[PDB]
C-alpha cells in the first residue's frame, strides 16, 4: 500500500489542505470569510491556545484533516470510475 | 441517632422511634398520616404473628417429613388432612371463618373505639379486653404470664423482639413460597441439598431464578 | 516513646501502651469502643495461649510419633492405647462438660472482675486475679508473677501472636503439602526449588469427608485447591 | 400522602376506578352466568 | 499545559485540583450554572473512581498472562482476560470453585455494601462513622474530600503526611489511573481487532513491528 | 457567544400539593369551579404553556419535559 | 420479548429524564436557544450516527438472516444473530468480501464490498420487496451525508456557520429588507418552530406513504 497510487493521493490531499490553511490560504478557527470568500478575523468562543506563530490550533489540524480525506477519497473513487 | 434501614439518610419525620422495631424505613411515605399509621402498626403485627405461625408450622412438619415419621409437606398438607380424616372442606372454612370474624370483628371496632370491648357486653368479661396499646391487647387472657405489666423496659425489649422475629418469619414464609415455585421440593429438602453442595446447589442454578444461566 | 508497627505511622488515642505489647496496630478501629477492647484482649490472649499449646503440641508429637500424621491424629483408630477406637460420644461429653464449666467460670470473672475467684466447694482457697486475663495463685504456683509483670506479659502476648501465625502455617502446610512442618521443612531442605509454594499450592490434600465411626464429617481446605 | 389520595378523590380517577369496578363485575357475572336473557 | 488547551477553561482551572492540565476544550467543569452529575465535584470524584478502578484492570488483565509466560502458574490458567468468563460467548473458565452467576451474586451484595456506603459518604460528609458496623465505623469517618477519604485502613502506612507530598502522590495517582484507563482501551480494541491477549499482542508487535500493528491488523 | 451546558438546580419541588388543586396553572382556573364551563377550560388550557406564564425559560422547560414524556409513551 | 423489556426500560429512562429535568436540573434559556448546536447534532449524531448503527446492523444481522431465509433455510437452523457477528467464517462463505475485513474501507477499495453493497433496485424476486443490501448502502450513504451535514453550523470554534449571518446576507431588490429579524423569531417564539416542523413533518409522512407502496422495503409487503 506504501508508494500506491491512494496512498499517495491522500497523503498530497491531507499534506495540501494542511498547508493551505497554515499559509493563509483556507478557513482556520482564527480567520473565517465574508460572502466575498475574503479571509476576515473570527470570533471563536474557545479562544484554543497554541505556541504556533500562525495560531494554528488542534481544532485546524482537525478541520484540515478531515476535508483533506474528503477530498481524498473522493479523487481516488473518481479515478477508478474512469479507468485512470 | 438510632440505627436506621440505610445509613446516612435522616429518618421520616413520621417516625421517631418510638415504635418497636423503627428503623426509619418508608420511602413511599404509606404511613405518614397518623391514623394510617396506627392502623399499619396493628396490620405489620397481625401479618407478623400470623407469619411466625406459620414458618414455626412448616419447620416443624418439614421437620417431621424429613426423619421417618409421616409427616406431609406443608403444600399438600391440607389435602392429606381434608381426605385422611372424614372433615368437610366448606364446614371448615365456615367454622374458621365465623370465629375469625368474632374475633377480628372485637379487634377491628377496639381499634375504631379504644377500650369499648371492656363494657362487659361479652359474657361479662370486662378487664380481659380493655387492652393495653394499639396492637398490644394485655390482660389475663391474651398474657396470662402478665410479662406486659411488670418491668417496662422488658416489655419494651420483648417488643421490639416481636416485631424483628415477626418481620423475619414473613421474609421466611415468602422465601418457602418461592423455594416451593422454583425447586419443587420442600424446604427442608432444599437445606438439605444445599448443604450436600452449596456451591452447586442454590438459586444460581435452580435453572429458575436466572433464566440467562 | 514506644516503637510503633510502621515507621511514620501515629498510633491511635486509645492505644497509649497500657496494654502489654502494644504497637499502635488498629487499621480497622475495632478498639474504639473500651468494653471491645476489654473482650477482645481477652480473645487475643485465649488465642494466644491456646495456639502456643497447639503449635508445643504438634512439635512434640512429631518428634516423639513421627508415625503419626497431627492432621489425621483427631480419628479413634489414630487414637493411643488404651483409647483407640474409643466411643467419640463420651470423649465428647467429658470434654463439654469440664470445658463449659470452666469456660463459665472465665466469662463470669470477665463480666464481673473478681467475683468468682473464691473455690465454690472449700471456701478460703481464692486466687488474686490483679488483671483481667491474669488469674494467678493456683494457676502460677511457681510463683513467676512477683517481679516485672509488664515485661513478662509483653513476651507474653508476643510468643503467643508468634505461635498463632506459626500454627495458622502448619495448617495450610499439612493442606497443601499433606505433612506436618517438620516434614514440610526436611522436604524443602532437600530441594528448596522444588518444593515451595509455587508449586505445592493449588492443591488440597484433605478429602471430601471422613466417616469418624458411623457419621460423616465434611471436610474442606481454607483455599480452593485441587481435591 | 394526604395530597396523594386527595388527587385519587377527584373526579377522573374516581370514575376511572368506579367504571373499572362495574364494567368488572358485570363482566364476571357474565362470564360465570353465560348468556342471561330472562330471569 | 497541554495541548487543546483554552482561555474558555484556563478561567475556572487554577491549578487546584490534581492532574489540571487545562485540557477541557468541551468546558466540563465550568461552576456556572451547573448541576446534576456535571459538577466539579462528582467529575473529579469518578475521574479518580475510574482511574483506580482502570489501575487494578490494566494490571490483572495483562497479569495472569505475563505470569503464563513466565512458567510461575501452570497451563490450566493463563488465559485471555476476555475469555476468563467476562464474556461466555468470546470464552469462559470451568475451574472456579463455583458457577459464574453465584460468585456474581456475591460481588453483587459485597459491591452493593462497599459501593453504597461509599456513595453515603459522598452525598453526606463523615455519616458512615457514627452509625454501628460492627466497629468499624471509626475508619469510615472519611475527610472533606470524598475522592480521598483517608483514614486508619484508606491511608494505612501515613503515606503524604505534608501537604506538598499528598499532592505531589495525588498527582501521581491521577496520571498513573489516566494511563491505565487509556491502557484499558487499548485492551478492549486489542481484543476486539486482534481477538488475543495484550501481552500477545505486544510480543508480536516486539518481533516484526513493521509486520504487527494496526494497518495490518485491518484485514 | 459561548456553547454550553446551563442548568439550574432544583427549581421545582417534587410533591402531589399541587395534584389535588386543579388549574394551578393559570391564575383564572385557580380560583376553582362555579361553573361546568371552567371543567372544560381545564382541559383546553392544560398544554397552553405560553398561556399560563411569559417567562420563556418557563415555558422551555415545560416543553422539553413534555417531550420526555411523549417519548416514554410511545416506548 | 427482550426488545420488549428494552423499550419498557426506555419508557422509564424517559419519564426519568422528564421529571429529572423540570424538578432537578432544569436547563436554562441560553440552553435551549442554542440552534446551531442543536442542529449540528441532530444532522450529526442523530440522524447521521442513527443510519449508521442501523446500517452496521443490517450489514451484520438483517443481510445474513435474510438471505438464508429467502435461500429457503428454516430459521431454527440460522445461526444466532451474534454467532455471525462472532465469527469471519460464517459471513465469508455468505459474503467473500467479509474474509478481508475491515481492510478494503481504509484502503480506499470500497468495490471489493460489492457482494452486500450493491445497486439493484427493482425488487427481491422471492420476497417482493427491496433488496436488503441497497437497503444497507442506503443508510450508509446517508450516514455520510448526515454526518458532513453535521459539521456546518458554528458552534464554540471559528470554523462553521453562523444562521443568522446567512439570513441576513440573502437580499435582493425585490423583497426589501429580506430575512432579517427571521433568527430572532425562530429563537424565541415555539409556536413558529412548530409551525414550520409541523409542516415539513406532515409533508414527509404523506412522501413516506408514496414511497413505501411504490418500493416496498419490507419482505412480503407488497
Ligand atoms: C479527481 C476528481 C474527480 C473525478 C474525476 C470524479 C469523478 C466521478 N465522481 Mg467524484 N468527487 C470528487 C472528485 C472527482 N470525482 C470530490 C473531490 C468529491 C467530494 C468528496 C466527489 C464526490 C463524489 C460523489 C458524492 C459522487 C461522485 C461520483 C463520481 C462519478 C460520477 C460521474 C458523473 O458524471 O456523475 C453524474 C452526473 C450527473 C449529471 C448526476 C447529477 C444528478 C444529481 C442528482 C443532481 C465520476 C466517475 C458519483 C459516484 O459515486 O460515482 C458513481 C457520486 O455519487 N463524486
Ligand atoms: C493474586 C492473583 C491470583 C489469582 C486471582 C489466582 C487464581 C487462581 N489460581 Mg493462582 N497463583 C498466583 C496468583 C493468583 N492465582 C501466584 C502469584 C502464584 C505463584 C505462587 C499462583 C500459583 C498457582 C498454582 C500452582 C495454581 C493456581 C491455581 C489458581 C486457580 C484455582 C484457585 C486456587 O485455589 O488455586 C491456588 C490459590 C492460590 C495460589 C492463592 C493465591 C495467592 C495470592 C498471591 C494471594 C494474593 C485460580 C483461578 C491452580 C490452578 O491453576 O487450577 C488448576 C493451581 O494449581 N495458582
Ligand atoms: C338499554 C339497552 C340494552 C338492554 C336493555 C340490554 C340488555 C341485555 N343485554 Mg345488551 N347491549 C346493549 C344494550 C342493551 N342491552 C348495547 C348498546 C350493547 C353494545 C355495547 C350491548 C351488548 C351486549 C352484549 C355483548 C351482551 C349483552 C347482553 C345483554 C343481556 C344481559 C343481562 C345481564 O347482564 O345479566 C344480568 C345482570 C345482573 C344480574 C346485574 C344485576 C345488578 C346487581 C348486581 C343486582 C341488583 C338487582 C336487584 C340483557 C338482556 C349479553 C347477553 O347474553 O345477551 C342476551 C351479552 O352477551 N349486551
Ligand atoms: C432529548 C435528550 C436529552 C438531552 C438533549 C439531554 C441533555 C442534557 N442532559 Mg440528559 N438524559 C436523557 C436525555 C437527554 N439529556 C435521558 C433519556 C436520560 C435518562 C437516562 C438522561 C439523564 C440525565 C442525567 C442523570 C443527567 C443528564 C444531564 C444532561 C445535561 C448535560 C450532560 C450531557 O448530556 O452532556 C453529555 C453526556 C454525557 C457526558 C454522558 C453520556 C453517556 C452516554 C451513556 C453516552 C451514550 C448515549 C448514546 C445515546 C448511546 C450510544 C449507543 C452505543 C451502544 C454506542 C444536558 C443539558 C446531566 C445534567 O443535569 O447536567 C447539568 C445529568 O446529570 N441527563
Ligand atoms: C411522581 C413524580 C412527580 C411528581 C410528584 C410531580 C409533581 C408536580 N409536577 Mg411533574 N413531572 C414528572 C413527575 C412528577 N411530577 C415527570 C415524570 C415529568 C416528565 C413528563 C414531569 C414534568 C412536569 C412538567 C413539565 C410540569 C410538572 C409540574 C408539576 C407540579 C404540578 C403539576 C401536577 O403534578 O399536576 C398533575 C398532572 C397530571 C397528573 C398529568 C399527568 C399526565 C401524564 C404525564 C401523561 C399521561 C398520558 C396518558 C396516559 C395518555 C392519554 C390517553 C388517555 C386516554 C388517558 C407538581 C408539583 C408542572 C408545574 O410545575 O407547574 C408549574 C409542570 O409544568 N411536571
Ligand atoms: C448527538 C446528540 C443528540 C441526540 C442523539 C439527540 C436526540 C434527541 N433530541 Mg436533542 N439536543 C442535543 C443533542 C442531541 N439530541 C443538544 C446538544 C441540544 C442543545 C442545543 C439538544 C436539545 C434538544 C431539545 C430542546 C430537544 C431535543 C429533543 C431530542 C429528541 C427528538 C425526538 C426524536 O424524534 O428522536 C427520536 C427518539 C429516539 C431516538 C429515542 C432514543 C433516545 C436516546 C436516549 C438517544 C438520546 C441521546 C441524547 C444525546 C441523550 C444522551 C444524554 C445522556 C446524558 C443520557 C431526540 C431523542 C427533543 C426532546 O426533548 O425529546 C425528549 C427536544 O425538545 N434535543
Ligand atoms: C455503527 C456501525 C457498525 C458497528 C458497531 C460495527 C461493528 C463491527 N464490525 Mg462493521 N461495518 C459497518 C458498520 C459497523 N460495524 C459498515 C457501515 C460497514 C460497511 C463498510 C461495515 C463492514 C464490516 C466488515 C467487512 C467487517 C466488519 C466487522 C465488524 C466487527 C469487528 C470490527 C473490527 O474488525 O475491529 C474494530 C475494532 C474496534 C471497533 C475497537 C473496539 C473498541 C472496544 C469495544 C473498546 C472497549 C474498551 C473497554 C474499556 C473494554 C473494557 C471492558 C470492561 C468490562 C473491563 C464489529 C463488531 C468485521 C467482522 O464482523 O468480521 C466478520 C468485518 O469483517 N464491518
Ligand atoms: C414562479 C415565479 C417565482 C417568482 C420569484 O421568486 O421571482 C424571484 C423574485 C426575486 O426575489 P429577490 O431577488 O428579492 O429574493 C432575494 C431574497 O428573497 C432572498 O433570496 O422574487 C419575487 O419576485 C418576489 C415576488 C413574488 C413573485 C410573485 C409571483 C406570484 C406567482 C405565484 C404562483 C406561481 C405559479
Ligand atoms: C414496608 C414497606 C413500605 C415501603 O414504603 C415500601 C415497601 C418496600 C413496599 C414496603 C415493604 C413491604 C414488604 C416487604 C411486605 C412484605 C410482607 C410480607 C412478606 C408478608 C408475609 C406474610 C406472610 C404470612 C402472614 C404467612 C403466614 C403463613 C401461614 C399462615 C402458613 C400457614 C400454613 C402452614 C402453617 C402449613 C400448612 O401446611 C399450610 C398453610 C395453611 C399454608
Ligand atoms: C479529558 C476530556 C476533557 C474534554 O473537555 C471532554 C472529553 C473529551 C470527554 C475528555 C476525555 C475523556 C476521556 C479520554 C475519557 C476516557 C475514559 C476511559 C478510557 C475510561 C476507561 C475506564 C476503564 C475502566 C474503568 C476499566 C476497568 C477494568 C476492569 C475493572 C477490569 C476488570 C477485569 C480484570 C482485572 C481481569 C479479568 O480477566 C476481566 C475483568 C473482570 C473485566
Ligand atoms: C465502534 C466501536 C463500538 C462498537 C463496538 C463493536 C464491538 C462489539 C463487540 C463484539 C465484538 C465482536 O468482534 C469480533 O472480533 C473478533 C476478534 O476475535 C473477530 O474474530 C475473528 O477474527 C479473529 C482475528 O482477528 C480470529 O481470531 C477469530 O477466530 C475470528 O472469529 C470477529 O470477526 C468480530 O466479529
Ligand atoms: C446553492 C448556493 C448557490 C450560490 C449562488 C452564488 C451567487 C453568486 C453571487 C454572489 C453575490 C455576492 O457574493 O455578492
Redesign the pocket.
Request: glycine share 40%; aromatic share 0%.
Given at each position: 500500500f506504501i508508494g500506491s497510487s491512494t496512498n499517495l493521493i491522500m497523503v498530497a490531499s491531507t499534506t495540501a489542505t494542511l498547508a493551505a490553511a497554515r499559509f493563509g490560504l483556507a478557513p482556520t478557527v482564527k480567520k473565517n470569510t465574508t460572502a466575498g470568500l475574503k479571509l476576515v478575523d473570527s470570533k471563536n468562543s474557545a479562544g484554543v491556545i497554541s505556541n504556533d506563530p500562525a495560531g494554528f490550533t488542534i481544532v485546524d489540524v482537525l478541520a484540515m484533516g478531515a476535508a483533506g480525506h474528503?477530498?481524498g477519497?473522493?479523487?481516488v473513487?473518481?479515478?477508478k470510475?474512469?479507468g485512470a | 441517632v438510632r440505627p436506621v434501614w440505610f445509613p446516612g439518610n435522616p429518618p421520616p419525620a413520621h417516625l421517631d422511634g418510638s415504635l418497636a422495631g423503627d428503623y426509619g424505613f418508608d420511602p413511599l411515605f404509606l404511613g405518614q398520616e397518623p391514623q394510617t399509621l396506627k392502623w399499619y402498626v396493628q396490620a405489620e403485627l397481625v401479618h407478623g404473628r400470623f407469619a411466625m405461625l406459620g414458618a414455626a408450622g412448616i419447620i416443624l412438619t418439614s421437620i417431621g417429613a424429613k426423619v421417618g415419621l409421616g409427616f406431609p409437606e406443608w403444600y399438600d398438607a391440607g389435602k392429606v388432612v381434608v381426605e385422611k380424616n372424614n372433615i368437610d372442606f366448606p364446614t371448615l372454612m365456615v367454622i374458621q371463618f365465623y370465629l375469625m370474624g368474632w374475633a377480628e370483628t372485637k379487634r377491628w371496632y377496639d381499634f375504631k373505639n379504644p377500650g369499648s370491648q371492656a363494657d362487659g357486653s361479652f359474657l361479662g368479661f370486662t378487664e380481659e379486653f380493655k387492652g393495653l396499646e394499639n396492637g398490644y391487647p394485655g390482660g389475663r387472657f391474651f398474657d396470662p404470664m402478665g410479662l406486659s405489666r411488670g418491668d417496662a423496659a422488658k416489655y419494651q425489649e420483648y417488643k421490639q423482639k416481636e416485631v424483628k422475629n415477626g418481620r423475619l418469619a414473613m421474609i421466611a414464609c415468602l422465601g418457602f413460597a418461592a423455594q416451593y415455585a422454583a425447586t419443587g421440593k420442600g424446604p427442608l429438602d432444599n437445606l438439605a441439598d444445599h448443604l450436600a453442595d452449596p456451591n452447586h446447589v442454590n438459586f444460581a442454578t435452580n435453572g429458575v431464578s436466572i433464566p440467562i444461566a | 516513646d514506644r516503637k510503633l508497627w510502621a515507621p511514620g505511622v501515629v498510633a491511635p488515642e486509645y492505644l497509649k501502651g497500657d496494654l502489654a505489647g502494644d504497637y499502635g496496630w488498629d487499621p480497622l478501629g475495632l478498639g474504639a469502643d473500651p468494653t471491645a477492647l476489654k473482650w477482645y484482649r481477652q480473645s487475643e490472649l485465649q488465642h494466644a495461649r491456646w495456639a502456643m499449646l497447639g503449635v508445643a503440641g504438634v512439635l512434640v508429637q512429631e518428634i516423639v510419633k513421627p508415625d503419626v500424621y497431627f492432621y489425621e491424629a483427631g480419628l479413634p483408630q489414630n487414637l493411643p492405647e488404651p483409647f483407640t477406637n474409643i466411643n467419640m460420644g463420651g470423649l465428647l461429653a467429658w470434654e463439654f462438660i469440664l470445658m463449659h464449666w470452666v469456660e463459665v467460670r472465665r466469662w463470669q470473672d470477665y463480666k464481673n472482675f473478681g467475683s468468682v475467684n473464691e473455690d465454690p466447694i472449700f471456701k478460703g482457697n481464692k486466687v488474686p486475679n490483679p488483671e483481667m486475663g491474669y488469674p494467678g495463685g493456683i494457676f502460677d504456683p511457681f510463683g513467676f508473677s512477683k517481679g516485672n509483670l509488664k515485661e513478662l506479659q509483653t513476651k507474653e502476648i508476643k510468643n503467643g501472636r508468634l505461635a498463632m501465625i506459626a500454627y495458622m502455617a502448619f495448617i495450610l502446610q499439612a493442606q497443601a503439602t499433606g505433612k506436618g512442618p517438620l516434614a514440610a521443612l526436611s522436604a524443602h531442605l532437600s530441594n528448596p526449588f522444588g518444593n515451595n509454594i509455587l508449586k505445592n499450592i493449588g492443591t488440597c490434600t484433605v478429602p471430601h469427608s471422613v466417616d469418624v465411626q458411623g457419621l460423616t464429617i465434611p471436610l474442606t481446605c481454607l483455599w480452593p485447591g485441587s481435591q | 400522602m394526604k395530597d396523594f389520595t386527595t388527587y385519587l378523590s377527584t373526579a377522573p380517577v374516581i370514575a376511572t376506578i368506579w367504571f373499572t369496578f362495574t364494567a368488572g363485575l358485570l363482566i364476571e357475572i357474565n362470564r360465570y352466568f353465560p348468556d342471561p336473557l330472562v330471569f | 499545559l497541554y495541548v487543546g488547551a483554552s482561555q474558555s477553561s484556563l478561567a475556572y482551572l487554577d491549578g487546584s485540583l490534581p492532574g489540571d492540565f487545562g485540557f477541557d476544550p468541551l468546558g466540563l467543569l465550568d461552576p456556572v450554572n451547573s448541576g446534576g452529575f456535571i459538577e466539579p465535584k462528582w467529575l473529579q470524584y469518578s475521574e479518580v473512581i475510574h482511574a483506580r478502578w482502570a489501575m487494578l484492570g490494566a494490571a490483572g488483565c495483562i497479569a495472569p498472562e505475563v505470569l503464563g509466560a513466565a512458567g510461575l502458574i501452570p497451563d490450566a490458567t493463563n488465559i485471555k482476560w476476555f475469555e476468563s468468563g467476562v464474556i461466555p460467548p468470546a470464552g469462559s473458565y470451568n475451574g472456579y470453585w463455583a458457577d459464574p452467576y453465584t460468585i456474581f451474586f456475591v460481588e453483587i451484595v459485597a459491591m452493593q455494601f462497599a459501593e453504597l456506603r461509599r456513595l453515603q459518604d459522598f452525598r453526606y460528609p463523615g455519616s458512615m462513622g457514627q452509625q454501628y458496623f460492627l466497629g468499624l465505623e471509626a475508619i469510615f469517618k472519611g475527610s472533606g474530600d470524598a475522592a480521598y477519604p483517608g483514614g486508619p485502613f484508606f491511608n494505612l502506612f501515613n503515606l503524604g503526611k505534608t501537604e506538598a507530598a499528598m499532592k505531589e502522590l495525588k498527582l501521581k495517582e491521577i496520571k498513573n489511573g489516566r494511563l491505565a484507563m487509556l491502557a484499558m482501551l487499548g485492551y478492549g480494541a486489542q481484543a476486539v481487532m486482534t481477538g488475543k491477549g495484550p501481552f500477545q499482542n505486544l510480543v508480536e508487535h516486539l518481533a516484526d513491528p513493521v509486520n504487527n500493528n494496526i494497518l495490518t491488523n485491518f484485514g | 457567544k459561548k456553547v454550553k451546558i446551563a442548568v439550574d438546580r432544583n427549581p421545582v419541588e417534587t410533591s402531589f400539593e399541587k395534584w389535588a388543586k386543579p388549574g394551578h396553572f393559570s391564575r383564572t382556573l385557580s380560583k376553582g369551579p362555579n361553573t361546568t364551563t371552567w371543567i372544560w377550560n381545564l382541559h383546553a388550557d392544560a398544554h397552553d404553556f405560553d398561556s399560563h406564564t411569559s417567562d420563556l425559560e418557563e415555558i422551555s422547560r415545560k416543553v422539553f419535559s413534555a417531550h420526555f414524556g411523549q417519548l416514554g409513551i410511545i416506548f | 420479548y427482550t426488545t420488549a423489556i428494552g423499550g419498557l426500560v426506555m419508557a422509564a429512562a424517559m419519564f426519568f429524564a422528564g421529571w429529572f429535568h423540570y424538578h432537578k436540573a432544569a436547563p436554562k434559556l441560553e440552553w435551549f436557544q442554542n440552534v446551531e448546536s442543536m442542529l449540528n447534532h441532530h444532522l450529526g449524531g442523530l440522524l447521521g450516527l442513527g443510519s449508521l448503527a442501523w446500517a452496521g446492523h443490517q450489514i451484520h444481522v438483517s443481510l445474513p438472516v435474510n438471505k438464508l431465509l429467502d435461500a429457503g433455510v428454516d430459521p431454527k437452523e440460522i445461526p444466532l444473530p451474534h454467532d455471525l457477528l462472532l465469527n469471519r467464517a460464517i459471513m465469508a462463505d455468505l459474503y467473500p468480501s467479509f474474509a478481508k475485513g475491515i481492510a478494503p474501507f481504509f484502503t480506499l477499495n470500497w468495490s471489493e464490498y460489492s457482494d452486500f453493497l450493491t445497486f439493484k433496485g427493482g425488487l427481491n424476486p422471492v420476497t417482493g420487496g427491496l433488496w436488503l443490501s441497497d437497503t444497507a448502502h442506503h443508510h450508509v450513504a446517508i450516514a455520510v451525508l448526515f454526518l458532513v451535514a453535521g459539521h456546518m453550523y458554528r458552534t464554540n470554534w471559528g470554523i462553521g456557520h453562523s444562521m443568522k449571518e446567512i439570513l441576513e446576507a440573502h437580499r435582493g431588490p425585490f423583497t426589501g429588507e429580506g430575512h432579517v429579524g427571521l433568527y430572532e423569531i425562530l429563537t424565541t417564539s415555539w409556536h413558529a418552530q412548530l409551525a414550520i416542523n409541523l409542516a415539513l413533518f406532515g409533508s414527509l409522512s404523506i412522501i413516506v406513504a408514496h414511497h413505501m407502496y411504490a418500493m416496498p422495503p419490507y419482505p412480503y409487503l407488497a
Open positions: 474528503g477530498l477519497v473522493g479523487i473513487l473518481g479515478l470510475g474512469i | - | - | - | - | - | -
